[PDB]
Structure 1
Amino acid sequence: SRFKVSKLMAYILRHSPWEFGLEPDEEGFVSIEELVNAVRKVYPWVTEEYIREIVERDEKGRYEIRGNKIRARYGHSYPVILRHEEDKESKVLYHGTVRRNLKGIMREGIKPMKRQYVHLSINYEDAYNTGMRHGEDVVVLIIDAECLRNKGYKILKAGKKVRIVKHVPVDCISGIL
């Protein structure tokens, strides 16, 4: 199924490419032909055409293909430089978290995992569902994207709804939902 193969693709491209013999470049790209060979170790019926179809049909824009190169657009647990197109249009974004984090966030702002990027959403429901990954008592922060930009932060379009930014200062948190 598309779901099973996509879940494996996301694991390989975000978390464990070397386990499958793949060496991502600094931007997270691997050869799509080598990715097919890797995936076929688990699902031998997969084809390059199938992987390209998964990329084209993905509801979140999880993946990006350029020529012969494929990457995950977000969610890596290893260092990447993501030169995604800038979101210059959003006025408001959302960050899902858990209530226990408010104390720290209200003192320090939102910091990323591994000093990478903070993940934001254009959509409240997506932010809520993301926050549920860290606990049941979810709150969604409203982020003033214009004030982020005015402080010098570039907000990048990582997926259809996912946006990434280096840091969110407390001054740009405009509400809690």
Structure 2
Amino acid sequence: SRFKVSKLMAYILRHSPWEFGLEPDEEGFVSIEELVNAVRKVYPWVTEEYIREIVERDEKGRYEIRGNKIRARYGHSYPVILRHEEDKESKVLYHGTVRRNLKGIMREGIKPMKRQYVHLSINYEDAYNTGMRHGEDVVVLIIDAECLRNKGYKILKAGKKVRIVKHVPVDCISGIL
């Protein structure tokens, strides 16, 4: 299924390319032909056309293809440089997290923790669902993106809904949901 193959694509492109003999470039790109070869080690019926269809149909915009190169746009667990188009349109964004982080966030802002980018979403439901990944005490922070930009932070379009930024200062958090 698309769900099973996309799950393997995401694992290879974000977390363990070397396991499949792929070496991502500094921006996380690998040869799409080599990704087909890697994926067919699990799912031999997969084709390059299929992988391209998965990219086109992915509801989050998880994947990006440029020429012969394919990458995950966000979510890597290894170091990657992500030079995505700037989001200049959003005025409000959302950050889903858990209540236990509020004390630290309220003093320090939203900080990069292991990855070098803070993850935001244009969609409140998406942020809520993403916060649920860290537990049941979910809170969603409303972020004044215009304020973020005015402070000189560039917000990049990493998916259809995901947005990335270096840091969210406390005074850009307008509310807690």
Shorter-chain TM-score tier: over 0.9
Offset of residue 112 of structure 1: 1.7
Describe the SS at the equivalent of 2:38: helix
How many residues end up aligned between the 2 structures?
A: 177
Q: 2:77 touches 2:115 (CA, 8 Å); kept in 1? A: no
Describe the SS at the equivalent of 2:114: helix
Equivalent residue, structure 2, for 1:165 = 165
- Over the aligned positions, Cα root-mean-square deviation in angstroms equals 0.6
Offset of residue 43 of structure 1: 0.4
Equivalent residue, structure 1, for 2:45 = 45
Offset of residue 114 of structure 1: 2.1
Describe the SS at the equivalent of 1:74: coil
Unaligned runs of 5+ in 2: none
Runs of at least 4 residues of structure 1 off by over 6 A? none
Q: For residues 73-113 of structure 1, give each alpha carbon's deviation from its aligned partner in whole angstroms, at most 9, with x where no partner exists.
A: 00011111111000000000000000111000001000123
CA distance in 2, matches of 1:164, 1:171: 18
Unaligned runs of 5+ in 1: none
Equivalent runs, 1:117-132 vs 2, <5 Å: 117-132=117-132
Describe the SS at the equivalent of 2:163: strand
Q: Which TM-score applies when normalising by structure 1?
A: 0.99
Describe the SS at the equivalent of 1:113: coil
CA distance in 2, matches of 1:114, 1:175: 25
Offset of residue 115 of structure 1: 4.8
Q: 2:92 touches 2:144 (CA, 8 Å); kept in 1? A: yes
Describe the SS at the equivalent of 1:96: strand
Equivalent residue, structure 2, for 1:66 = 66
Q: For residues 42-96 of structure 1, give each alpha carbon's deviation from its aligned partner in whole angstroms, at most 9, with x where no partner exists.
A: 0010000000000000000000000000000000111111110000000000000
Q: State which drifts further: 107-116 or 81-90.
A: 107-116
CA distance in 1, matches of 2:73, 2:151: 25
Q: Which TM-score applies when normalising by structure 2?
A: 0.99
Mapped pair 1:133 → 2:133? yes
